[PDB]
């Protein structure tokens, strides 16, 4: 059981911003409950498999993409080039949204909502859920920061170790080569002396 909260603007009242909360169990196919709030009044509705299936069948579209479009629209997943316009008539309590592409409207879905007699409870639940999410995110961020610090320390130690190794290899190589050049110089001096003696 999870849910998503988004900000929704209405054409009737563009200045005022409403809140849309969509709650589902495991996946949008089974169903979902949508709550619309304005801070003073609340509306609630539910969509089960039958209604979504009938709406998809009527629209003559593959059911595999209707769920995707609904998710993109109602979960604030619209892209930069995608614009969705919502309209909620209070007199009949009828909600419906369309997609504005290429300067032509296109209906997606229509729902009938029912007023909630206790708007306070839904607002309180929304605020409590938001606070719980904030706390969980803060704890996760703290743990992740600790892990990042540990990883950075490990990386610095590894870099220092590699520097040590390169320095040691260079020192060993230079020492050995110095010894060898000294010995070879002595041998060449002996060769030159022997050649000079043989010249006689």
């Amino acid at each position: 059981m999870e849910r998503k909260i988004s900000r929704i603007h209405l054409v009737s009242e563009p200045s005022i911003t409403h809140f849309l909360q969509v709650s589902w169990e495991k996946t949008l196919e089974s169903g979902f409950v949508i709550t619309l709030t304005d801070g003073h009044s609340a509306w609630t509705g539910t969509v089960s498999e039958s209604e979504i299936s009938q709406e998809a069948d009527d629209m003559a579209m593959e059911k595999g993409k209707y769920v995707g479009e609904l998710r993109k629209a109602l979960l604030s997943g619209a892209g930069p080039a995608d614009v969705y316009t919502f309209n909620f008539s209070k007199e009949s309590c009828y909600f419906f949204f369309e997609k504005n592409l290429k300067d032509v409207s296109f209906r997606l879905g229509s729902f009938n909502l029912e007023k909630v007699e206790n708007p306070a409870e839904v607002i309180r639940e929304l605020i409590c859920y938001c606070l719980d999410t904030i706390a969980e995110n803060q704890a996760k961020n703290e743990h992740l920061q600790k892990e990042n610090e540990r990883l950075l320390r490990d990386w610095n130690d590894v870099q220092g170790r590699f520097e040590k190794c390169v320095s040691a290899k260079e020192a060993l190589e230079t020492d050995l080569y110095k010894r060898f050049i000294l010995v070879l110089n002595e041998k060449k001096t002996k060769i030159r002396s022997l050649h000079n003696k043989l010249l006689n």
Binding site: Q159, F162, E163, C165, V166, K169, E170
Partner: protein
């Protein structure tokens, strides 16, 4: 000693010939360290003795190096990271023509 005669200059400094502009490159720094450990000569200052130049995934500095090499008596070669990795893996030098 397979890189004894191949001195390599890395683009790990934002400003050339400036020791105060050290970057925090992750792959570049250790790659330069490995090159030095493997016998190559790394110089922090770009002088006339440089022979090869290595530039990371930052392509913004390619123009600067291409302009600098024009004034230099000898022109160095710009190579990518696959060259060094392949050379180490195969234990033998790879042709720069495939990695220019």
């Amino acid at each position: 000693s397979m890189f004894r005669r191949h001195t390599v200059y890395l683009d790990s400094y934002a400003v050339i010939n400036d020791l105060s502009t050290k970057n925090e490159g992750t792959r570049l720094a250790i790659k330069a360290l490995e090159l030095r450990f493997h016998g190559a000569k790394v110089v922090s200052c770009l002088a006339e003795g440089v022979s090869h130049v290595i530039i990371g995934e930052d392509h913004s500095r390619v123009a600067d190096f291409k302009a600098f090499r024009r004034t230099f008596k000898r022109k160095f070669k710009i190579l990518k990271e696959s060259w060094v990795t392949d050379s180490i893996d195969k234990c033998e030098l790879q042709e720069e023509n495939q990695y220019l």
